[PDB]
Design a protein around this ligand. Structure first.
Ligand SMILES: CCCCCCCCCCCCCCCCCC(=O)OC[C@H](COP(=O)([O-])OCC(O)COP(=O)([O-])OC[C@@H](COC(=O)CCCCCCCCCCCCCCCCC)OC(=O)CCCCCCCCCCCCCCCCC)OC(=O)CCCCCCCCCCCCCCCCC
Ligand SMILES: CCCCCCCCCCCCCCCCCC(=O)OC[C@H](COP(=O)([O-])OCC(O)COP(=O)([O-])OC[C@@H](COC(=O)CCCCCCCCCCCCCCCCC)OC(=O)CCCCCCCCCCCCCCCCC)OC(=O)CCCCCCCCCCCCCCCCC
Ligand SMILES: CCCCCCCCCCCCCCCCCC(=O)OC[C@H](COP(=O)([O-])OCC[N+](C)(C)C)OC(=O)CCCCCCCCCCCCCCCCC
Ligand SMILES: CCCCCCCCCCCCCCCCC[C@@H](O)O[C@H](CO[C@H](O)CCCCCCCCCCCCCCC)COP(=O)(O)OCC[N+](C)(C)C
Ligand SMILES: CCCCCCCCCCCCCCCCC[C@@H](O)O[C@H](CO[C@H](O)CCCCCCCCCCCCCCC)COP(=O)(O)OCC[N+](C)(C)C
Ligand SMILES: CCCCCCCC/C=C\CCCCCCCC(=O)OC[C@H](COP(=O)(O)OCCN)OC(=O)CCCCCCC/C=C\CCCCCCCC
Ligand SMILES: CCCCCCCC/C=C\CCCCCCCC(=O)O[C@H](COC(=O)CCCCCCC/C=C/CCCCCCCC)COP(=O)(O)OCCN
Ligand SMILES: CCCCCCCCCCCCCCCCCC(=O)OC[C@H](COP(=O)(O)OCCN)OC(=O)CCCCCCCCCCCCCCCCC
Lengths: 115, 83, 121, 98, 174, 171, 105, 347, 71
């Protein structure tokens, strides 16, 4: 309830700022003013063409490591259990496997960008 | 031992970050199995009363179960008080 | 699944202890001889595929083929006999314990039974 | 059953129908595949939280883990297809015939 | 009542309709992010704050990679929006109409689908009267992944490591 | 499948304990030490009977013990207790940590006027035993008779008669 | 199909998580722990066919606790009748149902 | 691909299948399916080319959709029962979802096209592993949940699989597509017997796996992936063609070969349940499979096709790598009819 | 003490709900007041609408969302 009211207040304030921005000042638009900016010269192609991503493997590894951090997050509560030895073994197991994944990718050159 | 010393010297000059990382990880793996306070942590986690201590029906043959909380029978946290 | 989940069944047990009370298959069992024949055929096919003399080459290899087939065949026959004996045991137990479902019937002779006659002409 | 379960099951059905009806892009179908697992996660956690199945609260996290493993697999296959053909169009996956 | 969970469920279905009508991966990711946030809200209302925040965070991270990949792999000269194409707009309107019809029928009467029977009443009605104390049941059950569920941790970690190996092998080429 | 039987509104009435959570928390260890017997009896009844309608008298005895305890406090240590729970009430989390002086005065007052010893650490959480006259619930779950188990295997194992009997195989 | 390695070796890999009446952390009970316990103890050792034939009462109570369909039907019927009665002014809610009372602590 | 990586991927595929076959929990079974698919995709993409990439993409899409439907069925079953143990499913809708998902994973019609497409796309070793192991797992799940299977749906999909496999194999000339349609027909037979005797399902699985292994290993030995490529094998090593001919005769169900035992036992078992029309239709439809097996046998061993001139150098050279258990698979796929009553041991 | 208070409060709410049900469902042809939906006679905890069903929206919202919405 309170969080919803806060979110509504913030979004309303931002929208009001946009509305004031687009209606208060004097407007004068023509084709040259609204054309895309490429440092004074017309763009040769289009900005919607494919843009090669030289770190494509690191993004997938980031997805997997995001899973790893999601698994690791409930650790502060897991340390309140009586099975401390088992919990410690499992936490260290997960972190060692994550380290092994990082080392394997590093040695197999998955962290290097495409040329 | 000479090969190990040379490897450690070379790594400490080229990859001090990795040397420190592996040292910290190895100490994190090994030390808990040697510290005598791991069992203390286990006991402290056990001593925490999250839920209600449901009493037991007295059969007249429960000498180790206290009748009142302040009776001598039952677990004591005197070790935890001075810790 | 008929005999899966049978009471007292130990999982992953090829031959339980109760199977020891059944007669073991004879070493001259025709089924064991057929298993040895299968092993010999496998050895001959192995020689043929490897382009060795089919009948003469690899006598040790052919002997190992026959021996392995006979060994596994003996144990397989033991398990098969145990399972069939178990099936008969369960069937007889059910028949005995459900007499109203399996009642004896009065036997009439063919002098009392009337069967229609169909001439062939 | 309350209407919340109806809405979540309808969301799963919509995401399933989206995946089974390709348009041009493999990436769009990968997004449709990711949404199905989001609906599964929401349905599972709504069921588990309502019945107080305490030990089952770890199941949705494993669900998310294998979800993003599948997403990683799909992205890898998509980059291989895009390298092969220049576009992620599913029309180019026609070399093999039934 | 206030029908907060029902409204959120409707918004969830709307976001699903969007990214399933599939205008283009940019707007599909936008709709999936909206759906993830709304599902976080739904499960927060139902009780799982950790689970809601985790699903929202995981999908926010996941759609970041999708944006970079559609900028490189799944882009065209004129990316399609819902009103740009007739097929996309038709699918979007069909999904919206089906959702509106289901909502109206459910609110007016106890709607029994061809698959399941749904009763129009309170999500607050279906809840439990009892309460926990001085701990979170969801947090304890999730943290039980390490004391309990040793097997699950093993298979999950092995799957993640094998996934790293697999994504390395698939994109090897040659 | 039957009419749910509920206590009437007349026998659910009892003299309430009309003090706030801060007042209850201030006099919490002394309360747990002084009224242990009725509270433990009520808790044992609740966990054995698994039915609120079967332990109403125990709850009324709990209320009576609490009222007597607070009347004993009121007759002797009204001012130190008032200062203690006024200190406790200010804190948002109602922390014992911030009121160790007013708590000291209250403990001194109850130890002298009433001879009360505050429990040590780990004593109220101990599992104690209760002497009760109410019989042990024989069927608290209202279970039915369990279905009879299937008969076990009997007799020794004999070889299959005539073998497999699979078509023409004679073994 | 099913190689019961867990039963053979005495391992516990997922049986701890199969049911909601098993050992839970901090002894947190399930919503329908009693009903699941009753159904399981009824159906134990008699097989699926006999369990479905004979423990149907326990299973129906379990499913009713799980989903609350009959209870929701009763609540909806009472609500509809009360709304119809107050539509014609034939029913007056009590002040304690209207919010003019002091509830119990 | 490094040999260590390849063997660890094979180990992971087998680990996923074994997790499926040993787990008593639906979540763990789904985890096993996911692990199997994840480690199976690179095995398909081992020999990198556009055809292999396309086959892997189609396989991944099909298996991901099946896994989504399977998890939905699991969740729906949990909603109405609160049970995670794999037993008879408590909701007919969840059972239908699970049946469709497992049929899609197996390749039962009308979920079959990916089977010929992927089998043609991938190499011979990949096709062998795919067929055998990826039929091994979902059939285990189905055998566990057989008692809640809808007989109408299962038998409909089975008969469709038999008919479609027969017709597709009739049309194809590519050996991998022929093997895929044969797989579709055999899966149809197995799932047709499934709602009555899981023991007969397992027996047919074992015989089919033996025959498929023998045929695929013979193809790898001859290095022939088309009909005309196989037509040149008689001029280099005529023994392999004869062994392939007898294996083809066995796979067609001709007595007294091993392929007749599963059909015979399944027909008997279905007859015990007062089914006559279905056994008769299934028996009559397999003649299409026999026809295209016989057509393949005509081209390879029973006739001599023209050869080329470098076959003389091929004569001069000898096969190096030795197939493991190939003679055993050839013998077990043709000469185990007298050992039929061992299905009790299989029970 | 809180367990006893909770039991008394729940029983009182159930009893007054039963009285109101008797007042309301009086002309219904086939309706038994207070009839259970369970075959067993064992006590079953009220769900949420058996207590706060015939009560005000403020009370219902507080009971069902007050803890979650309190921040
Ligand atoms: C080379 C291999 C042989 C070497 C010489 C023998 C070495 C071993 C000597 C030994 O130990 O002898 C003791 C043993 C005597 O046993 P016993 O104690 O007198 O028998 C009493 C038994 O308790 C009960 O006996 P029973 O009369 O009840 O018989 C039971 C029978 C009941 O079942 C039946 O009656 C049905 C049988 C047919 C079922 C399947 C039909 C469809 C398939 C047809 C074939 C397809 C593939 C081609 O079931 C079986 O036997 C199960 C297996 C069926 C086949 C048995 C084959 C035995 C010989 C194995 C090698 C065969 C090679 C053939 C080709 C040779 C080419 C060079 O002798 C043998 O077992 C020798 C058998 C004959 C061997 C020579 C080959 C004859 C082939 C005849 C084929 C037609 C029949
Ligand atoms: C013996 C009767 C067996 C009956 C059936 C039993 C089950 C099968 C037997 C097991 C497998 C045997 C070995 C197969 C490969 C053979 C290769 C070969 O050349 O072999 C020649 C070989 C000698 O030649 P070599 O100098 O070693 O090498 C020359 C090159 O191989 C020269 O090679 P190549 O480069 O000239 O190769 C070209 C040739 C290559 O052709 C072959 O290699 C033909 C054989 C392989 C085809 C598949 C064989 C069967 C596999 C199981 C399938 C089911 C079988 C039952 C089917 C029933 C319904 C039909 O291809 C063609 O000519 C193409 C045109 C024909 C194609 C269309 C016809 C196909 C017929 C398929 C079915 C045949 C069934 C009977 C097979 C009998 C084989 C001996 O002789 C044998 O292998 C004879 C068999 C073993 C005899 C052992 C005798 C021991 C001592 C006496 C024991 C007396 C009884 C004991 C009891 C105590 C008494 C006192
Ligand atoms: C979508 C948002 C809804 C909620 C809005 C909540 C309040 C927003 C507060 C922020 C305001 C930001 C702008 C600040 C002021 C400066 C700009 C300004 O004055 O803009 C006003 C704009 C100014 O027009 P403009 O386009 O020339 O704006 C440029 C202004 N200068 C020159 C200063 C740069 O006024 C209008 O657009 C309308 C002018 C009169 C014509 C009326 C036409 C009819 C429709 C409206 C009247 C009501 C009709 C009722 C009947 C309907 C049915 C027939
Ligand atoms: C070794 C066999 C090799 C062949 C088979 C390979 C199969 C894969 C490898 C499987 C190895 C693990 C099997 C045993 C799992 C143990 C599960 C559980 O029973 O043991 C735990 C004990 O765990 C131990 O601490 C060690 C766990 C194993 C540590 C990691 C070793 C496994 C590495 C696997 C590498 C990845 C390969 C797997 C995929 C192929 C429980 O301890 P506990 O505290 O009482 O539990 C508390 C529960 N309470 C609260 C109810 C009481
Ligand atoms: C105490 C110290 C001593 C211990 C001794 C060891 C005890 C036995 C150990 C067994 C090996 C360890 C486990 C390894 C895996 C077990 C595999 C096997 O042993 O299990 C049996 C399985 O045995 C095999 O099924 C039999 C193999 C038969 C092979 C031939 C099949 C018949 C084909 C018909 C034609 C035959 C042609 C001739 C063939 C050569 C039964 O296990 P079960 O848990 O219950 O299976 C559940 C699935 N079911 C119920 C559907 C069956
Ligand atoms: C009554 C209408 C009140 C104002 C609504 C304005 C919406 C609109 O049509 O204007 C779009 C206007 C831009 O118009 P241009 O194409 O750039 O040229 C005209 C510049 N005035 O966009 C905006 O002003 C931003 C709208 C505020 C965001 C609120 C959304 C939440
Ligand atoms: C095993 C228990 C610890 C558990 C895990 C430890 C935490 C996580 C650490 C692993 C993360 C990934 C590690 C990756 C290791 C290999 C990566 C690699 O390839 O390194 C190479 C190889 O370089 C090396 O030297 C390998 C690192 C060797 C360090 C290991 C030493 C082990 C130390 C053991 C304890 C010693 C205690 C000494 C204490 C000193 C004071 C702290 C250099 O990289 P470049 O490609 O050259 O950089 C890009 C250039 N364009
Ligand atoms: C050498 C080349 C390879 C082929 C080897 C073939 C023989 C292999 C077995 C050797 C003898 C092993 C043995 O001890 O067998 C005895 C056993 C029966 O013994 P038992 O039953 O205890 O005695 C009678 C009691 N009433 O016997 C059995 O249990 C029988 C099991 C074996 C069945 C064999 C079936 C035929 C195998 C092919 C024979 C080929 C003969 C020609 C080879 C020519 C080589 C150039």
């Amino acid at each position: 309830m309170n969080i919803m009211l806060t979110l509504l207040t913030n979004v309303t304030l931002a929208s009001l700022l946009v509305l004031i921005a687009f209606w208060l000042p004097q407007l004068n638009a023509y084709s040259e003013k609204t054309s895309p900016y490429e440092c004074g010269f017309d763009p040769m192609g289009s900005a919607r063409l494919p843009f090669s991503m030289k770190f494509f493997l690191v993004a997938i590894t980031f997805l997997l490591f995001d899973l790893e951090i999601a698994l690791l997050l409930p650790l502060p509560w897991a340390s309140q259990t009586n099975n401390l030895k088992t919990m410690l073994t499992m936490a260290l197991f997960l972190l060692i496997l994550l380290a092994a994944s990082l080392a394997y990718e590093w040695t197999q050159k998955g962290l290097e960008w495409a040329e | 031992a000479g090969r190990i010393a040379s490897f450690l010297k070379n790594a400490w000059a080229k990859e001090p970050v990795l040397v420190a990382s592996f040292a910290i990880g190895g100490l994190a793996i090994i030390l808990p199995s040697l510290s005598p306070y791991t069992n203390y942590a286990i006991r402290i986690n056990r001593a925490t009363p999250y839920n209600y201590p449901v009493p037991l029906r007295d059969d007249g043959n429960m000498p180790d179960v206290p009748s009142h909380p302040q009776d001598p029978q039952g677990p004591s946290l005197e070790w935890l008080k001075n810790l | 699944t008929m005999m899966s989940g049978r009471p007292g069944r130990v999982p992953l047990q090829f031959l339980p202890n109760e199977a020891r009370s059944l007669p073991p298959p004879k070493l001259t069992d025709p089924r064991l001889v057929y298993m040895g024949f299968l092993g010999y055929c496998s050895g001959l096919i192995d020689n043929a595929i490897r382009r060795r003399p089919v009948v003469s080459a690899g006598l040790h290899r052919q002997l190992l083929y026959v021996t392995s087939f006979v060994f596994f065949g003996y144990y397989l026959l033991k398990r098969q006999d145990y399972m069939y004996a178990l099936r008969d045991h369960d069937m007889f137990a059910y028949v005995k314990s459900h007499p109203e479902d399996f009642p004896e019937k009065d036997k009439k002779t063919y002098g009392e039974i009337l069967e229609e006659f169909h001439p062939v002409r | 059953m309350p209407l919340v379960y109806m809405n979540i099951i309808m969301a799963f059905a919509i995401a399933l129908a989206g995946l089974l009806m390709y348009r041009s892009h493999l990436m769009s179908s990968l997004l449709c595949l990711e949404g199905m697992m989001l609906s599964l996660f929401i349905m599972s956690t709504l069921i588990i939280l309502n019945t107080h199945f305490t030990l089952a609260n770890m199941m949705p996290i494993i669900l998310l883990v294998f979800a993003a493993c599948e997403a990683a697999l799909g992205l890898s296959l998509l980059v291989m297809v895009s390298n092969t053909y220049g576009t992620d169009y599913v029309q180019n996956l026609n070399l093999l015939q039934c | 009542t206030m029908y907060i969970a029902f409204i959120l469920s409707t918004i969830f279905v709307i976001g699903f309709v969007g990214f399933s009508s599939k205008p283009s991966p940019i707007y599909g990711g936008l709709g999936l992010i909206v759906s993830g946030g709304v599902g976080c809200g739904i499960v927060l209302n139902f009780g799982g704050s950790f689970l809601g925040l985790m699903v929202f965070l995981i999908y926010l991270g996941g759609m970041l990679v999708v944006f970079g990949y559609t900028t490189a792999m799944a882009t065209e000269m004129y990316p399609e929006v819902w009103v740009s194409n007739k097929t996309v707009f038709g699918a979007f309107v069909s999904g919206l109409m089906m959702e509106f019809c289901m909502v109206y029928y459910a609110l007016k009467e106890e709607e029994v689908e061809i698959i399941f029977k749904f009763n129009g009443l309170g999500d607050w009605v279906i809840y439990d009267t009892g309460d926990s104390g001085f701990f979170s049941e969801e947090a304890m059950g999730i943290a039980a992944l390490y004391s309990y569920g040793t097997w699950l941790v093993i298979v999950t970690g092995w799957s993640l490591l094998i996934g790293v190996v697999v994504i390395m092998e698939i994109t090897r080429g040659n | 499948p039957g009419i749910v039987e509920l206590p009437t509104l007349e026998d659910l009435k009892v003299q309430e304990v009309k003090v706030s959570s801060s007042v209850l928390k201030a006099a919490a260890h002394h309360y747990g030490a002084q009224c242990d017997k009725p509270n433990k009896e009520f808790m044992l009844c609740r966990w054995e009977e698994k039915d609120p309608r079967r332990c109403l008298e125990e709850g009324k005895l709990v209320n009576q013990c609490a009222l007597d305890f607070f009347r004993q406090i009121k007759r002797h240590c009204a001012e130190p207790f008032t200062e203690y729970w006024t200190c406790i009430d200010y804190s948002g989390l109602q922390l014992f940590r911030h009121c160790r002086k007013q708590q000291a005065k209250f403990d001194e007052c109850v130890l002298d006027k009433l001879g009360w010893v505050r429990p040590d650490l780990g004593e109220l959480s101990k599992v104690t035993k209760v002497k009760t006259d109410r019989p042990l619930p024989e069927n608290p779950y209202h279970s039915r008779a369990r279905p009879e188990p299937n008969p076990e295997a009997e007799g020794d194992l004999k070889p299959a008669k005539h073998g497999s009997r699979l078509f023409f195989w004679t073994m | 199909p099913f190689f019961d390695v867990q039963k053979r070796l005495g391992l516990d890999l997922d049986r701890w998580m199969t049911i909601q009446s098993a050992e839970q952390p901090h002894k947190i009970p399930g919503r329908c722990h009693a009903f699941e316990k009753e159904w399981i103890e009824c159906a134990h050792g008699i097989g699926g066919i006999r369990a479905e034939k004979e423990c149907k009462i326990e299973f129906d109570d379990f499913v009713e606790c799980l989903l609350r369909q009959k209870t929701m039907k009763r609540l909806s019927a009472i609500k509809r009748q009360r709304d119809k009665l107050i539509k014609e002014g034939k029913y007056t809610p009590p002040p304690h149902h209207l919010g003019k009372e002091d509830p119990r602590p | 691909m490094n040999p260590i990586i390849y063997t660890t991927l094979i180990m992971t595929v087998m680990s996923g299948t074994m997790l499926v076959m040993i787990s008593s929990h639906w979540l763990l079974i789904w985890i096993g399916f996911e692990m199997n698919l994840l480690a199976m995709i690179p095995v398909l993409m081992k020999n990198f080319n556009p055809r292999a990439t396309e086959a892997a993409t189609k396989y991944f899409l099909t298996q991901a959709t099946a896994s989504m439907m399977l998890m939905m069925a699991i969740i729906i079953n949990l909603l109405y029962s609160g049970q995670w143990t794999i037993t008879k499913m408590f909701n007919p809708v969840a059972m239908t979802m699970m049946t469709m998902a497992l049929a899609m994973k197996l390749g039962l019609s009308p979920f079959h096209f990916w089977v010929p497409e992927v089998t043609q796309g991938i190499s011979l070793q990949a096709g062998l592993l795919l067929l055998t192991w990826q039929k091994l797992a979902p059939l285990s799940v189905l055998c566990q949940i057989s008692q809640s299977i809808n007989p109408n749906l299962m038998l409909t999909m089975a008969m469709l699989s038999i008919l479609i496999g027969g017709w597709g194999g009739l049309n194809q000339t590519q050996l991998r597509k022929i093997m895929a349609y044969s797989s579709i027909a055999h899966m149809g037979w197995m799932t047709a017997v499934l709602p009555y005797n899981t023991t007969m399902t397992i027996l047919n699985l074992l015989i089919y796996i033996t025959m498929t292994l023998a045929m695929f290993m013979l193809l790898i030995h001859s290095s022939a992936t088309t009909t005309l490529s196989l037509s040149h094998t008689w001029n280099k090593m005529p023994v392999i063609t004869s062994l392939m001919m007898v294996t083809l005769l066995s796979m067609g169900g001709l007595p007294p070969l091993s392929g007749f035992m599963p059909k015979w036992m399944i027909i008997q078992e279905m007859t015990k349940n007062e089914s006559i029309i279905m056994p008769t239709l299934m028996a009559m439809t397999a003649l299409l499979n026999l026809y295209f097996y016989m057509r393949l046998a005509y081209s390879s061993s029973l006739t001599m096709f023209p050869s080329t001139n470098n076959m003389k150098m091929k004569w001069q050279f000898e096969h190096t790598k030795q197939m493991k258990l190939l003679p055993t698979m050839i013998v077990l796929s043709t000469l185990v009819l007298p050992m039929t009553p061992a299905l009790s041991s299989l029970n | 003490l809180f367990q006893a208070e909770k039991d008394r409060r729940v029983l009182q709410m159930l009893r007054e709900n039963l009285e109101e049900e008797a007042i309301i469902m009086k002309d219904v042809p086939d309706w038994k007041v207070g009839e259970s939906v369970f075959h067993t006679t064992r006590w079953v905890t009220p769900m949420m609408g058996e207590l706060y069903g015939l009560r005000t929206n403020e009370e219902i919202l507080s009971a069902t969302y007050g803890f979650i919405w309190y921040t």
